[PDB]
């Protein structure tokens with residue numbers, strides 16, 4: 296098994312911590328959802344190749360521009376997250392997160408991930424966003440942003456229901472293995 | 475970690491750690507507050523354990539088995555004794571607050587109602603000045619430590635054998651040298667997230683809400699000071715590269 300490193304980046308409201316927790320336990324916690332994620336090394340076999348995939352969160356580092364980049368050395372794949380219930384989190388992808396990741400992780404594949412996809416058809420979410428003249432992010436808006444920023448690909452998931460979570464980390468492993 | 479504390483924090487939450495007959499005596503809001511305080515203490519116990527792996531397993535093992543050039547072990551593990559002293563002392567205070575709160579006849583049933591004052595004390599005065607000085611130094615030496623490790627692992631056979639030997643056990647899976655360094659750098663930025671969530675469930679006693687609000691502000695002041703005090707050191711960087719920053 297070869298060792299690879301994954302780092303997830305995105306705004307504070309993007310759901311990155313929850314995504315790492317649900318993947319690492321293969322379960323949305325039934326009793327207590329942790330506030331923070333330390334690290335984890337997942338054993339993943341993708342397309343016949345065994346990898347030890349180290350997982351890291353940047354939650355808590357969003358306001359600290361000299362501490363945050365210490366998370367990036369030797370990263371092999373980036374998950375760049377936004378929440379589908381927050382068009383504001385998608386707006387910050389090309390102007391802030393993308394230039395930073397391209398600077399500190401040159402040539403590292405980026406997978407743009409739309410989190411909380413279960414909220415796209417949630418009535419409370421649609422009512423709340425309508426007050427700010429907004430609506431949940433459409434799949435084509437996510438794909439277009441991923442295309443514009445030079446992402447390796449675009450994927451969606453729901454940490455709440457686990458749908459799409461395994462597929463995101465298996466694809467991240469395949470991207471990390473590419474030359 | 476020692477077995478007594480590992481067992482006390484083995485459960486995924488405070489609600490699963492205490493006896494169910496004790497849990498049922500509390501309101502939902504108290505259970506929510508206690509679950510987050512339990513996560514702050516549990517993650518602090520694990521952070522002190524990361525520092526013990528760095529000092530005892532790695533640093534001391536390299537001094538006792540290998541023939542590294544002087545200053546190499548300090549370069550790999552900058553400030554580790556100072557970091558261990560800071561966090562072992564803080565963990566001791568958190569565990570003593572829990573122990574005093576235990577019901578007589580129990581080693582697991584407790585409620586911590588006054589965490590705010592302990593956090594204000596940790597994040598103010600000389601202990602905050604020592605945390606700021608130590609993390610500004612450690613985080614500025616983080617890149618240099620990772621590069622020194624990579625160079626030694628690629629070029630020194632006895633160093634490679636030592637690392638592969640002590641990191642082979644499954645309990646070290648998440649704790650290689652580079653992983654320990656980043657776990658330590660990331661610890662300080664977990665505190666605001668945990669404190670804000672404890673504060674969300676601490677409105678019942680106004681003095682507690684005010685104390686956690688003060689502690690959250692002190693923690694963010696410490697983080698801002700550390701972040702402004704960092705500049706990565708680089709082996710071989712010339713003075714001209716530094717003064718042209």
Ligand SMILES: Cc1nsc(N2C[C@@H](C)O[C@@H](C)C2)n1
Nearest residue numbers: 360361363364394395398399
């Ligand atoms: C947090 C931070 N510290 S330095 C830096 N950048 C370097 C600059 C040349 O480009 C930008 C895109 C990213 N970003």
